[PDB]
Amino acid sequence: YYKFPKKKDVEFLPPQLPSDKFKD
Amino acid sequence: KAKRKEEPSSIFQRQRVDALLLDLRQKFPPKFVQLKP
Amino acid sequence: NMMEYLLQGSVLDHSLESLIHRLRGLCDNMEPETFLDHEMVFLLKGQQASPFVLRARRSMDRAGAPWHLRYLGQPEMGDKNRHALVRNCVDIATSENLTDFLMEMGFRMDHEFVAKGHLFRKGIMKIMVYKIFRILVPGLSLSYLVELSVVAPAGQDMVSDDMKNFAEQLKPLVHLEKID
Amino acid sequence: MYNCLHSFCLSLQLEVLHSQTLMLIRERWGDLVQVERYHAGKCLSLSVWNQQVLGRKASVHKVTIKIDENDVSKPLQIFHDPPLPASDSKLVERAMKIDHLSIEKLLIDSVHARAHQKLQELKAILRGFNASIETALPALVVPILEPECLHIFVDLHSGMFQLMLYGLDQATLDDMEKSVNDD
Amino acid sequence: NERLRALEDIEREIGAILQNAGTVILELSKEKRLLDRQAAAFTASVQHVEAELSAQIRYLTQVATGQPHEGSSYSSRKDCQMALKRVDYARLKLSDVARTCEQML
Amino acid sequence: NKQTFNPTDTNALVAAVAFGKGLS
Amino acid sequence: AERLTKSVTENQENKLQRDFNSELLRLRQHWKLRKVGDKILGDLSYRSAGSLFPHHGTFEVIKNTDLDLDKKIPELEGSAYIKVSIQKQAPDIGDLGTVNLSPHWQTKLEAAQNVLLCKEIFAQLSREAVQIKSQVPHIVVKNQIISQPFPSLQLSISLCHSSCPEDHLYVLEHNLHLLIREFHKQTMMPHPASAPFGHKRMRLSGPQAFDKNEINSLQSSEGLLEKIIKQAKHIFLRSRAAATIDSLASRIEDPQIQAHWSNINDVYESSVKVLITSQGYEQICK
Amino acid sequence: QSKETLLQSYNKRLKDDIKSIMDNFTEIIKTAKIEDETQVSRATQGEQDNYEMHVRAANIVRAGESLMKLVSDLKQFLILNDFPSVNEAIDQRNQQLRTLQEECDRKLITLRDEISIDLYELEEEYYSSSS
Fold this sequence. Notes:
This is part of a larger assembly, with eight protein chains of eight kinds.
Chain A: no helix or strand
Chain F: H1 7-18
Chain G: H1 2-7, H2 10-13, H3 19-31, H4 104-126, E1 138-140, E2 145-147, H5 172-185, H6 200-203, H7 212-217, H8 224-250, E3 258-261, E4 272-275
Antiparallel strand pairs in G: 1-2, 3-4
């Protein structure tokens, strides 16, 4: 994306993933 | 918004990678940006 | 040693189809079957006014298989927060030699009513069903009595919770009960 | 940009290889040959060949690897029990010297090299006894006549290298096996 | 096919004329033809559909805890396909033998 | 509202199975 | 009324592919029943008799605006391909293989069933490295199980994912059936006397005090041993046939030899009839 | 859990809603306001009472002629029972595949017999060759 790309803050880790589909 | 967005079969298990991910800003300090040239 | 359990009950005649159909497709591989037994309920007493468990009821099916009896009597106390429990046993004997020794030891009979029915292979447990028939030697509540017959040593006795869960699942036309 | 992914990729690679080893010993080998020495990240520490049955007397020296925060010249800086007991197949993890293929690969390399070393050791005394004998890919072969027979192999997973002479007298060669494992 | 036929009948009778019966009282626009539609398809069809729905609702309710209504779940159906594979292999072998015989001409 | 369970049959069958209580 | 008779008249005119009460039942009535984790119903894992390892099933019905389009339920994701060329020698396996390859939903289903089958086969046979290491040296690395009864030929029939002597077909079916056979032998219901819930042979211990030999023969081994014995018998029969047929070529002027094999050859047992058959004479059968 | 109770409650709610839609849409279906009972106004209030059907009359007839088939399909889809408790079409498939494999085995045995006949007859011919 263009905009301003001023996403500083911190974190820079987490996961952002998904596969919950096995009775769990 | 229907075909795909992020990830369908994106299973954990080796997500463990996450686990290590939780090492890296730590192995080395993120540099300040504040520049949207 | 071992233990004994029971989930005694009864059901009407007309209401058997849906019951046996539900009970069948639970843990059985395939090919459900049935069996006709033979009543030789005996009694071994005469010295202390306290009879023994001599219900030597063995099936009259294909030969080769050895006849035997199981211990079922004198319900012992205990079973804290559990279902019916009583010390039981089992002992197989030679074909027709068991009754020979019973008659040689001077014992009497107890009943002559035969109760044929079906069997169903459960999982960690076992269930059975039968209906009492008042007939002659070669051929009556009029209701299929069912129960959860299962034998096991002391172990953990956690099977009581599983039996209660099954009874909960077997809600419509059957329940569990003890005997005294 | 150079250093970031360099340590990161190799680190995640060794970690997932460790995980794969755990999964493999979980169902394939089990308590038979397994000792976990990996303490906390940044380095692998396995132990497979050891005093599992106290029969063998490298017998306990296992393998391990780390990063050591050094140049990227060495991929993993592998190290294990005393290697190169001979000078055959270059003794450097024969045919699988390079890493990144499989941990089980390096395991079979190590056990095969040690088995070859032991086979050469036995061949030494066999030849110094009298001429002559030969060897093969799995293990050595010693004849008795001038022709086949009298085959002997090595347990690639444990001590007490086995043997099998085509013929008769079973449950008796087990005494020979025990004596060879002991003395 | 009993339950399948019952479901098919319930589906075919789901769209009853009760929803379309809202134009039956206005049929008296000629004197103070099809006036019969205001009797049979006014409420009796809806009543019968509701009765059928209630009857279908009160079934045995077999499914209680786990996975009932099984029935394949198992053996040599697999080996039946395997026997088909053996038949195919025999076909291949017969074809090879026929090619050899043709070459033998 | 078809009845599927008989309460009287349950109590009667349990007492006539253990012994001959009610036969003689 | 128009919306009712136009949007629901699909099955009323002609039965076509439609997940709505017309397609989901066909696979269901054939494979499983109603189940819901989120939208998953009846995974094919053979757990009814597997008892080896569990695996869920990512199944979810879906629709699409097209012509002749079914529900297309989703799905291991791999495949199997078996080819036998077992005559070689190698110091270390690890290379690649030679890969060279309608109700689409059912095709995906059967492919998943087959891949789970071969996975379970390899899991069971893989549990043979740690064992009695005697009279059967064997190595295993990755999908390959190399073995040698004696140094004459190779072994380790195997397969791989996708994305001459005819010893290729009838080598896989046996080990394949071995799993369901082990399931059967340890599952047809016992029904020994009333319901002790045991085994027929096990229950038969009473009627006859069988010897220690029969006591041991009550159970048996499986897996690697069976396949090894089978391969040994096969290669041995092949070598015997080769020797017999080569005998004729090596000696022609000498009295030739006729060959006759049985018409019923057991798994392990077999028989061969061989006569002298002196040339141009029938009264020399001594 | 007892989902049959929830299904019965949903069916009863659907039936009650259908009955209400059939009943709450007959206040002006059987009459056209022939008399002026409105004490306030019959020219400006009574005329707007029927011209406001979208807020008064057509506010129930809209969903009342749309929710019926929707609820019908919902009930027919959420419960795809297939629960005859005996699985009628199971033993039939079993017998089908059993007959199939039986005929396959019979054909295989017959082919084996034919092949053995050919072999044995050719082996005798193989003896004839004195070379």
